[PDB]
Curated annotation (Swiss-Prot):
Family the UniProt entry places it in: Belongs to the calycin superfamily. Fatty-acid binding protein (FABP) family.
Gene: RBP1
Protein name, entry field: Retinol-binding protein 1
Xref: Gene3D superfamilies: 2.40.128.20
Biological role stated in the UniProt entry: Cytoplasmic retinol-binding protein. Accepts retinol from the transport protein STRA6, and thereby contributes to retinol uptake, storage and retinoid homeostasis.
Gene Ontology CC: cytosol; lipid droplet; nucleoplasm; nucleus
Chloroplast recorded as keyword: no
Residue ranges, annotated region (Important for interaction with STRA6): 21-31
Entry's Gene Ontology BP terms: fatty acid transport; lipid homeostasis; retinoic acid biosynthetic process; vitamin A metabolic process
Tree of life domain: Eukaryota
Record organism: Homo sapiens (Human)
A Pfam family assignment: Lipocalin
Length: 134
């Protein structure tokens, strides 16, 4: 129902250190992650989506069909593998990442001209907000 396609620049990044720690990211890699302001480059065609999380350090690429469970390789983040499903919730995207960590996933939606992303694991919540450059 919504088209997320765009290059979205980060404006807000709350509790990211707390989220990476809950994934057992070691202290040096958390130190550099503090420098980063990852952007979202998204291309979508219907239920097919590529979400490229771009940073000067390391990118993370997601490439998926909404509603199709897939083996997600989170190499670069915590190098785990998850059984992951992205689903439509109205205009919102809900992601459940099944694996070692409880309650791992995220929610993505657009409010106005703002891309919103909440990342969760073990009850830690990271809030990110992005905007296209007008």
């Amino acid at each position: 129902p919504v088209d997320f396609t765009g290059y979205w620049k980060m404006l807000v990044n709350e509790n990211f250190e707390e989220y990476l720690r809950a994934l057992d990211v070691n202290v040096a890699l958390r130190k550099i992650a503090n420098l980063l302001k990852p952007d979202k480059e998204i291309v979508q065609d219907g239920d097919h989506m590529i979400i490229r999380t771009l940073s000067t350090f390391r990118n993370y690429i997601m490439d998926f069909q909404v509603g199709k469970e897939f083996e997600e390789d989170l190499t670069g983040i915590d190098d785990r593998k998850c059984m992951t499903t992205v689903s439509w919730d109205g205009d919102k995207l809900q992601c459940v990442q099944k694996g070692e960590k409880e309650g791992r996933g995220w929610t993505q939606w657009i409010e106005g001209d703002e891309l919103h992303l909440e990342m969760r694991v073990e009850g830690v919540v990271c809030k990110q907000v992005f905007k296209k450059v007008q």
